[PDB]
Structure formats: C-alpha cells, structure tokens
C-alpha cells in the first residue's frame with residue numbers, strides 16, 4: 001500500500017476561539033541510548049601469523 | 051557475469067557481504083534520518099480555508115493548490131534550484147509526502163502554536179500566539195497588540211525578501 | 221529533548237552498554253473551546269493579562285493560566301494597563317474588579 005503519513009486532524013482555527021485544557025496526563029516515556037561497546041583488543045601479530 | 055572471476059573472488063572470503071551490508075546500513079540510515087527530521091507528528095494538520103491570521107500572510111510557505119506537486123512557492127523554488135553493479139534506491143518518503151509533512155507542521159504551528167508538539171493541538175488565534183512568543187523573549191503583549199499591523203507587514207516583507215534572496219543567489 | 225510533552229523530570233536506569241531514561245512529562249488533556257480576546261476595555265483603558273489569557277465561557281470573562289483551565293475574576297493584580305481601547309484590534313468590553321473598592325466603600 002501507499003503509506004499513510006497520519007490521521008487527518010483539521011484544527012478548528014478561528015480568530016477569536018482558544019482551546020484550554022481542563023485535565024492532564026502524567027506520561028512516562030522510555031528513551032534508550034547506547035553508551036559503550038564491547039572493548040575488543042586484537043593482537044595483530046597473533047591474528048595474522050599465530 | 052564472469053563465473054571464473056566469482057570463483058576466484060570467493061578465495062578472499064566475505065568481503066562482498068561486508069560491503070553490501072555497510073551500503074545497506076547507509077541506505078536504511080538515510081530513510082531513518084528523513085523519518086527523524088520530518089515525521090515528528092502523527093496527525094496531518096490542515097490549514098483553514100479562510101486565511102484570516104490577523105494580517106499575517108503565509109502564502110509563500112503554505113502549499114500552492116495550483117501546483118500538481120502540492121509544494122509551497124519557496125519549496126518549489128528550492129526544488130528548481132537544486133540540480134556495472136551500481137543502483138540508486140528510491141527514498142522511502144517521496145517528495146510530495148515530505149512536502150505534506152512540512153505542510154502538516156506548518157498548519158500545526160500556525161493554528162495551534164507549540165501545543166501540537168507537546169500533546170493535542172489546541173487552537174489559538176495567531177496574534178495571541180505571537181503575543182505568547184513575544185512574552186517568551188521578554189516583551190510584553192501590549193507591544194505586539196498595539197503594533198500588530200506593523201509586525202504583520204514586516205513579517206510579510208521579510209518572507210518576500212527570503213523568496214527574492216533565494217531566487218537571486220546561486 | 222526529554223520526552224513527548226512538557227518535561228517535568230527524568231529518571232536514569234542502567235542498561236547493558238546503555239542508559240534508559242524514563243521521562244516524566246505533563247500532557248494536556250480534555251481541552252474545551254472558549255471565546256478569547258486580546259485585551260479587556262475598562263474605563264477607557266486596555267487591560268492585558270500578566271501571565272495568563274482572557275477566556276469567556278459565553279457570558280462571563282475570566283483570566284486563566286495557559287496550560288490548565290483555572291478561571292479567576294479579572295482584577296487589577298492579574299492584569300496590566302497599557303494605552304486606551306482604540307488601538308488593540310479585537311478588544312472587548314468587560315468590567316474589571318478592584319480589590320480596594322470595598323475597603324474605601326465601607
């Protein structure tokens with residue numbers, strides 16, 4: 001299929017109307033970030049020549 | 051297409067697999083980069099049919115209905131001004147969908163300010179949003195409201211100068 | 221930068237060769253339409269909100285904080301006066317209460 005970018009949401013814009021929240025959600029989200037890699041050492045003489 | 055050359059190339063091992071894997075990683079990385087930059091909203095916002103923004107003109111940045119590509123005049127100018135085993139893979143996001151993402155971001159930031167980036171899009175009049183932005187940089191709301199026509203004229207002039215500068219500089 | 225929504229705090233968690241951030245953010249919800257005005261015209265003077273916004277539920281005008289609906293009476297402490305009513309486009313007429321008025325009245 002052709003991918004849908006998202007759901008259409010026509011915001012009801014007018015020159016004298018505002019939308020004010022009456023409630024809130026305390027949302028906890030996860031962010032995973034890699035920090036380090038495996039520390040690998042290669043003996044060049046031993047790898048090439050044994 | 052040489053079988054003998056491939057047979058001799060197999061003596062060198064998995065070099066070809068490494069190079070193909072690296073190029074595949076770069077190719078998926080480009081699509082990931084485009085997703086990270088442009089696909090930051092999951093709602094496709096649209097501008098109202100009446101462009102009554104308290105004097106602010108966004109025609110040079112909003113999409114042009116007359117163009118088949120559905121691009122803005124600035125975006126159309128930007129696209130006009132940029133000119134043996136190798137294949138070029140198409141990007142995952144085409145130019146019209148990237149333009150649609152930019153249009154959704156523009157509609158969200160015009161009709162809702164910064165509310166759509168932090169949650170649901172809350173409508174606010176654009177002069178009031180500009181007044182909020184003025185308060186953000188430490189200027190009182192009255193300065194924006196009293197000089198609203200001047201600020202709108204300066205903004206329109208600056209946007210036009212941006213289009214002229216892009217069209218006039220190689 | 222620190223989660224989707226208005227960032228409140230974050231908590232770090234160790235992970236194999238990595239870190240996991242639990243971003244605690246504030247998300248607005250259950251929004252409601254209100255009629256808004258840039259300024260309030262009272263006694264030939266224009267009043268602008270100090271930190272909030274003017275909202276109307278249909279018959280009465282209030283000033284509330286931008287990120288939560290908390291209507292309060294438009295007084296002289298929550299607003300500031302700059303100029304008359306002839307310059308601001310869209311200014312509406314509403315009364316502005318004075319806290320000092322019952323004191324000298326009594």
Ligand SMILES: *[C@@H]1O[C@H](CO)[C@@H](O[C@@H]2O[C@H](CO)[C@@H](O)[C@H](O)[C@H]2NC(C)=O)[C@H](O)[C@H]1NC(C)=O
Pocket residue numbers: 010011012013019251252253
């Ligand atoms: C604020 O009012 C507008 C219009 O008065 C509402 O927008 C309508 O919402 C309904 C419900 O989904 C849609 O079917 C209409 O098409 C919308 N009209 C327009 C012009 O956008 C809006 O929902 C109201 N906001 C809230 C929070 O109730």
Ligand SMILES: *[C@@H]1O[C@H](CO)[C@@H](O[C@@H]2O[C@H](CO)[C@@H](O)[C@H](O)[C@H]2NC(C)=O)[C@H](O)[C@H]1NC(C)=O
Pocket residue numbers: 022023024025250
């Ligand atoms: C704001 O939202 C919270 C939930 O996010 C509402 O709390 C719920 O209230 C109903 C009835 O009042 C209860 O049955 C639920 O158990 C409550 N949920 C939680 C998690 O406490 C709260 O009432 C809402 N407030 C307003 C003013 O709309």
Ligand SMILES: *[C@@H]1O[C@H](CO)[C@@H](O[C@@H]2O[C@H](CO)[C@@H](O)[C@H](O)[C@H]2NC(C)=O)[C@H](O)[C@H]1NC(C)=O
Pocket residue numbers: 101107108109110
């Ligand atoms: C917003 O700006 C556009 C262009 O920046 C205005 O369109 C111009 O309109 C005049 C007369 O209406 C024409 O002579 C020009 O040729 C138009 N320019 C272009 C590029 O089409 C537009 O009128 C402005 N105002 C609104 C409300 O859209």
Ligand SMILES: *[C@@H]1O[C@H](CO)[C@@H](O[C@@H]2O[C@H](CO)[C@@H](O)[C@H](O)[C@H]2NC(C)=O)[C@H](O)[C@H]1NC(C)=O
Pocket residue numbers: 277278279280
């Ligand atoms: C807008 O809000 C005000 C204040 O909350 C409302 O005024 C009150 O309405 C209740 C409901 O009948 C009355 O019992 C109170 O006596 C009213 N207070 C005052 C000071 O008059 C007002 O009704 C709301 N308007 C709408 C259209 O909802």
Ligand SMILES: *[C@@H]1O[C@H](CO)[C@@H](O[C@@H]2O[C@H](CO)[C@@H](O)[C@H](O)[C@H]2NC(C)=O)[C@H](O)[C@H]1NC(C)=O
Pocket residue numbers: 261312313
């Ligand atoms: C808000 O109040 C002012 C003054 O009370 C109104 O201005 C008057 O408008 C009438 C009708 O145009 C004129 O005849 C008067 O000379 C005006 N007086 C002043 C002092 O300007 C204004 O019209 C009111 N606005 C609304 C929306 O009711």
Ligand SMILES: *[C@@H]1O[C@H](CO)[C@@H](O)[C@H](O)[C@H]1NC(C)=O
Pocket residue numbers: 015016309310
């Ligand atoms: C908003 O638009 C209406 C027409 O749709 C107009 O009558 C009114 O004066 C406008 N208000 C402002 C503040 O621009």
